[PDB]
Every structure is written in structure tokens, then in C-alpha cells.
């Protein structure tokens, strides 16, 4: 059921999201990020992106989605959206079977170091990329589709 996982600290990320979306086919996009699925005026907008595009949404913690995902009924075709490389790994950590995580959108803060145009990470966040990728996961930086792939260092 799960087509994709993105990390993109824009989440839904306006026309990014709806490229992808449109892109890998899916019907349901699930927004997995604790802040936006306990505080839902912070929906709004990217449910607007949803009803504007014609795409069906959701807004989840972590651990609801650990919960429900498998529940998710054959003609749901789900892409996941994911603020950080930490909320992949507590999804991975919890079971559930991702086979490919983009990275797209991961900006700076003081310390971090640029891997890609879009991409800066902490040794926290490559630690977390590695530790999907260890658990078979294939992991690959894409800005949108039909861009070069990159592989984490």
C-alpha cells in the first residue's frame, strides 16, 4: 500500500507534493508528524493542497500511525510525509515495512553540514538515514522526480 516515503520539512510542500503524488500515484497522502496531527489549525493549508488537487489526506502521530497503517484497505495507495529522518526511523523502529525513503527538503540549523542542494544534516540525522538503510531500506536524496538520485555518503 505505502508507494513512498518523503522527508521534507515542508511536509506537503505545495506543488512538490502534489508533483509527487501525481507522479507515483497514490490517492492518500498520510502527513506523519506529531506537532501538525496534535495542533490541527496547522492542517489547514495542506489540506487545502489535498481538496485542491483532488488527493484524500491525513494527519497522524507516530504512534497512531504504528497503530492504523496496516489497516490501510487495498485501494488506498498511501505516500507518507515525514518532517525528519527521526520520524522514519520511529516508523521503522515500530515495524512497519518501508522499502524506499526519499529525502528531499532537510534545511539548516547551526552545525549542520550540507550533503545535497536541499539536504543538511547533523551526525544524529546521517546516524538515522544509516539505520534505515540497515534495515533495507533504500534511502536516496531526489528533489523531485526525474532528478539525478544521490546516495547518502
Same mark, same amino acid.
Given at each position: ?43 489547514? *493549508?495542506?489540506?487545502? @493542497?489535498?481538496? /485542491? ?10 504512534? %497512531?500511525?504504528? $497503530? !492504523? ?10 505516500? *507518507?510525509?515525514?518532517? @525528519?529522518?527521526? /520520524? ?10 518501508? %522499502?524506499?525513503? $526519499? !529525502? ?50
Amino acid at each position: 500500500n505505502i508507494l513512498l516515503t518523503r522527508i521534507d520539512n515542508r511536509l506537503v510542500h505545495g506543488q512538490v507534493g502534489v508533483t509527487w503524488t501525481s507522479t507515483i500515484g497514490a490517492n492518500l497522502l498520510v502527513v506523519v508528524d506529531d506537532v501538525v496531527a496534535n495542533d490541527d489549525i496547522q492542517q489547514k *493549508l495542506m489540506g487545502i @493542497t489535498a481538496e /485542491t488537487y483532488g488527493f484524500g489526506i491525513r494527519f497522524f502521530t507516530i504512534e %497512531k500511525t504504528i $497503530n !492504523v497503517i496496516g489497516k490501510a484497505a487495498p485501494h488506498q495507495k498511501i505516500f *507518507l510525509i515525514c518532517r @525528519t529522518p527521526q /520520524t522514519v526511523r520511529k516508523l521503522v523502529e515500530g515495524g512497519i515495512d518501508l %522499502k524506499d525513503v $526519499n !529525502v528531499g527538503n532537510m534545511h539548516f540549523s547551526e552545525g549542520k553540514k550540507q550533503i545535497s542542494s536541499k539536504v543538511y544534516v547533523d551526525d544524529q540525522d546521517l546516524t538515522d538515514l544509516r539505520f534505515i538503510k540497515q534495515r533495507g531500506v533504500n534511502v536516496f536524496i531526489q528533489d523531485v522526480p526525474g532528478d539525478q538520485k544521490e546516495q547518502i555518503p
